[model samples]
Target chain A: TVRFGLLGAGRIGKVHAKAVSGNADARLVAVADAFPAAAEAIAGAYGCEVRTIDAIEAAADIDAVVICTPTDTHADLIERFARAGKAIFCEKPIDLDAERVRACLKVVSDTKAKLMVGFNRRFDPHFMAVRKAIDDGRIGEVEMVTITSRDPSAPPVDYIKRSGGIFRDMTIHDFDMARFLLGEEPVSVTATAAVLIDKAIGDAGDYDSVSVILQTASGKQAIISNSRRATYGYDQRIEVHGSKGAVAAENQRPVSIEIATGDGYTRPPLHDFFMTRYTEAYANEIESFIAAIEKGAEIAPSGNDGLAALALADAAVRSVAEKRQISIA
Target chain B: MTVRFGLLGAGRIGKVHAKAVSGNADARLVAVADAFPAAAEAIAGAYGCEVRTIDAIEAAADIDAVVICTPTDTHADLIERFARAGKAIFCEKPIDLDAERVRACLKVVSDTKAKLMVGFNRRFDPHFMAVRKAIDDGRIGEVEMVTITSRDPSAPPVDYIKRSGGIFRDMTIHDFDMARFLLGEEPVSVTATAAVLIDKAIGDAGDYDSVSVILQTASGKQAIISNSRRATYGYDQRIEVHGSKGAVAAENQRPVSIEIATGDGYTRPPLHDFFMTRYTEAYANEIESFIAAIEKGAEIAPSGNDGLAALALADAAVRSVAEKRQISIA
Candidate 1:
């Protein structure tokens, strides 16, 4: 079994803790957190030892590290773990800044450390099936992509203060997804954003509603819509238009049942948030991570994927601020 | 209380509407008029209606409405003649190819105050109506973008292509109507590109088989449309609307909803191969809507203005293609 050292015992940390311990091919060996009680709670629940970040980095028994810390600590932890020669599965945004992510990725490249950035949406069964359909040529040549991601409600203004703004924090996931589906690198980005949903979010110097258009060198286009307030539910959907046909992965609900009457057809509401909506995806992502390490296969959504997405997010920030299209270098 | 109807043509589209009118409990087929006696006789025999001349149908006291399915050139004249005859009109699209002529015909319609509904049948499609309902209910918040895809299984005969007024007027008109339906705003500008991919004979006939168009409203809202004369699969139609909150789309459908999985991941059958089969329900629904309007003296959806707006977009698309630049609608 592949052994794991989970860092950070926060909300996202609990999610990964369960993902690691629940997988048959993986074992949680240690836990580390800034707070002793948080680490001890996870250690008690998983039958692991509460350890320091340095101690886990030096532990020869731990083969991989799952980093779930705050955004600021991600780069430092990734570089430290790369030097420690441990495979790393870090949550998204590797760093809020593109250059810092670049330097951290360089450390990973030089050490040849296996890194998998958490873009768990890529592993959602429905989304993966859609991508598989594309790979299988169900839709001839993918020429356009549309991604819609909206949260049921905005987080507190305090969270917005440190969340790297909406584009880098929320839309970055969609940017990575746009790259995953576009099959070509986006050469330019044009973005539009508004603070219509929450005034406090604007007062916090961030946006709650946004739209972005990305174009590749081949003129392929992708449109993404995002909002911090959905009022409906946590909405996530994707569609790819191609030369032959188009395929889409529709939003997932708690139930597939639909009611149709003279009033019209209505389905159950969508999953309320990412953690619940992406639970199975998180399991599948961890399983893939373990399987890749055990079978000696190349990892996906690598450090490079994270860096590329960050670069796009940065481009979008500039695009929105300048109110014009920004070209990627 | 049932409204009486006279079918103005007995061609393919006429047969479709005949079934719709006959199946609807609120409408009755009183007569059918066609240039060919046999064509009129075929429909009349099937629907138990009389086969009469256009002149006789125009003067018939029993007829309350006329469904114009005649050739495109005959549409405006029949509509004007029927309007003067005091009958409600439901003419299949393109009152005339020339916008000014269409405006002139509609003036006669307006002078007589005859209720006229254009046969932009896609708006009544159950799936499409559901999408519109979703928008009306604020399911996706304010609409920001729309995408439409429409492709036929294969091209029509070259003879039909000769008089079809090119792909823009003939094929993309339906998509134009759909864009207007979903966008809820007048498109101010259009950009288009076209190619003769299927049959060079089409190019020889001064027409195209593949086209793409982009329309933008004054509010920065956009709509994209893609069309082709050959799909290799079957007739495909779909619409998607993206708004502030989310997006909702109507997927394509086939006769059977079955998939067979094997070595090749999974495969479902191609789309419905004929427009008749693809829009069977829509044709029925549009006729019902027309019948209800006449029975209740209510306003008709897809009125002359709706048809004129779609035709204007088609005209703009044609100009955009010929000029290789964006054309402003105003």
Candidate 2:
């Protein structure tokens, strides 16, 4: 069995802890949080211990630590856990600073500990199959991949500022999926950020949405469109076009379906939210992580996956700022 | 009183003409024909027509023109019977084996002064009608390109495939007619390529069930058509016309406009089959034109000449597919 230690019991941290506890192969050994009562409350339900950060790291029983703390603190904490020689699972943008992430990787290497970054969307079943189909040559000689990801709403101004801007926080998933689907690293990033969709977003000094394009070293291109609102619902769709044919995975909606015919033709609205659409993907991703620990298989979506994807995201944001396509350095 | 008409064949197209003849307000039902007379007689009852032999329809003055809804072998004899008695005629396409045979029948038609229109029902479809209107209005500037798609849900039996006149005559004829309608000009050249990927039985019969063709006019205007015998969904029918400024197209029709979503993704079912649903209005409108042509002392379409043009395209497609090159109208 893979033992899990929760590092921060925040919003998404608790969610991940619940997933681990619920997983058949994973058990929450203990939890460490800056707030003692919050850690105690979460551990109380599972009958687990609440320990200090340093104490949990030194404990031999804690096999893995899930790092969900703020991005600024990630590098230092990763180094701390690396010294403790615990297998580390860090939430995305392992460190907001690319230089810091490189430093963290150095620490990870010196300590000889395993690390996997959380790029949850790669485990999305539909997206996974899209990649699988391309590999299978269902669509011959892939040429272009398009991803449309629009959020139901934007985060608060403070959150946007702290979340490492839109590219690193929001579209980073799209960037990673682009690389995953392209089956190679991207060489260039071109992006256009606009705050037209929501005036409130402009007031916050952050863009509401963006449209980005990535070109692989081999001339394959992936176009990603992000929006803050889609009147229909949570929106996520991916299309891969190849020489022979095209395969697409569109958005999902929970509502049964409706077709109103005022004109000659009919149409249906898009899915409203990602939570409803990608529910299984969330669970499946955690399962893959557990299975990796059990079988001693290669951890997918490793720290390198996050770092490589974030580098491209950072390049895209710089491209937006500079008003020109930027090469990934 | 609206006359009711009975359908003859109920196999594939028998039902289509059944709905077409039944849906017309001016037409009244009489009787039907089949190897099984009851099959014909049952449709006659549905449309309030009387079951009668071929001779009876020739003699029955109330029957107007005989629909000639019989097998291909009987088409010429039936048309001659109805035409000699001064009855109107609306025969399904390819009145005989080839243009020479059709020419011979034209002599008899001229001597008898008969009114006849071959059925190329696609000309009357509303989407195509819109395309025609867009051309007429010059909304898309000068028409330069036409694209037509016609695919069946499934391939026919091996026996039927042999008599299917390859893919060109049997399938791409509709596309040829669509090209003629969309181009509004005679195609100077026809080029076609076909394959039997869907069914080996089709290949065994020296016939193809999947095809592609390009029709060109003198002014650089072009029309391209793609046909396949099998569509995993349903019958796929669409037409597009590109012009100097913009392009207009008609989309496919599906049975239900519903989509379901889960963690996987959104999906909608395939399109509708049986042209009856896609071109239901075209059938009714075509019948009215025949009635109106008779009243106005005007010619009905697709006239015999239109049949000849479509036939030439089919001939050229056959040659093009065989030679693996383009064929000129000459």
Candidate 3:
């Protein structure tokens, strides 16, 4: 069985640590953080050991490391862990600099160590089923995939200031999902972005919402819509209309039930946030990571998955920059 | 005391007319008809009607109107018999396929002046009622466009599809009537396209499973209708009207309104497929309207004129589909 040592015991780190500890196939053996008490508190809760980031790298018992540190810290920590020959799970973008991630991945390949980047959305059951359905020929020839992912509200302006803009943070999941579902790398990206939802986002150098269309060489298209606020609730809906017929996967909300009469229509509120909606998928990612380590199976959503997602994000950012479709090979 | 009427056929449309007549308060059924006898007896027993032939119902003076629950070939003869003896009539959908035959039958309807109401039931549906209600309320500023989706659960057998007279005449007739009812204007042009996708047998019989038709008025207000013989879920049906100010749409219906959650995502079951189940209230409302029109002067909707116009549109859709161009309604 693979034992996990978690580095960066902050908010998202703590969440993944708990997922690892609770996962049946894996064990959270130790925790690490710059804030030692934060690591100690998490380790105490899960009945594991707490250590410094350096100690985690040196520890013989820790077979795997999950880096949930800040963006700037990811590349150095990933490079360090790759030298240690430990399996690595780095959460998204690594450094938001393609050259740095490429240099870090080079070190990883040189050591012949396994690396899994956290594009955790591919594990989402609904989106995965949609991908599988397309692969299974449920809807003849794939023509278009439409996704609308909107949050209940926007984040604080200070968070937005540090959040690498909406393209790097909020829309990165959709960008990754578009690639995963389409199964074809997009050759062209055209985007129209706006600051309609909030002025603070604009002040913080971010677009509050955006609509993008990705077209493949074969003319297959995926339309993505992102919004910072949805007063009714969080909106996540997907539809992929094919040549023969269309298959649509809609949002998972609090209310699947509805009441209708002379009084009209009513539905329950959408789920509160992504944390609750994708909880199982979050756990399943760690399980898959463990299974891949022990079974010699290829790590799904691997380093390539991370690169493709980053490329798409880069293309979209450029598309927004030029107000025209940018072609990518 | 409200006299309960008995239903006749338990087949697809027998169940429909049964629900319609049985649900009505004014009618009391004595019996139903069927060559299979048991099927007839089943619906008759359900609504407390007597089990007897058309002759028995014709002879019974207590029977107010004999709802002719029989095959297409027998409809004209049965209606003639029922109307000659002065019984009110409510026949399920088209009385016969032949336009000439329908004229001959209507000649009898005019000659006898029999109290008659044809079952064009979609107009009575609550969702369609909401459309008219929105129009009456002036919610949309002015109605400009209507969208209708009427797909079937699955295609009929080859023989049935052969006699069904293409998708337009057989399936889209209901939507045709609805377009007329909602647009509030006679269509001046019709354009259509059709393709055979669902079944090869349908192709062999020279008909299509998928078809789309556009009907436009003199004022340029339009209604677009789409029909197919297959839906993976239940019978897919919906209507939406776009006005200058806003849009209103009727949502799809589901059997049970429950969504269970355990981590697999919230999912509701598909809708009811059988039109009888989906439009039970519509059938009952149709009959009540028939009674109301005859007794209290409720204008027969989908009146004889409506029947002619919808038939004309159906004919137009076929011509347009064949020509791949708009055909004006002359």
DockQ scores for all the models shown? 0.09, 0.03, 0.02
Worst 10 residues of 2 chain B by lDDT: B1-10
Clashes of 3: 8
lDDT of 1 by residue, B1-330 (tens): 879999989999999999999999888999999999999999999989999899999999999999999999999998999999999999998798888989999999999989999999999999999999999999888876677878788888889898888899999999999998998988887766666656779989999877767776777567777777866668879898877777788999899988999996688888898878999999999998998888888988899988888889999989876764567788
lDDT of 1 by residue, A97-176 (tens): 88888899889999999999999999999999889989999888776677878888789988988998999899999999
Report the Cα lDDT for residue B73, model 2: 59
Tens digit of lDDT per residue, candidate 3, span A150-244?
88789999888877778778788888788877758888888989899889788778898898899988889999999998765667778888888
lDDT of 1 at B182: 96
- Once superposed on the true structure, which residue ranges of model 3 sit more than 4 Å away at CA? A259-263, B1-330
Judged by DockQ cut-offs, the docking class of candidate 2 is incorrect
Point to the candidate with the largest lDDT.
1
Q: Against the true structure, what is each candidate's TM-score?
A: 0.73, 0.56, 0.55
Tens-digit lDDT string for candidate 3 (B184-256):
8899999998899888889899888898889999999999999989876777789999999999889888667
Q: Let me know the DockQ for model 3.
A: 0.02
Docking class of 3: incorrect
Give one digit per residue, the lDDT tens place, for model 2 in A63-146: 888888888778788889889878788878788778888888888888887787878788888888888898898998878999
- The lDDT values for all models are 0.86, 0.78, 0.79
Model 2 regions more than 4 Å off:
A35-38, A259-273, B1-330
TM-score of chain A of each: 0.96, 0.91, 0.94
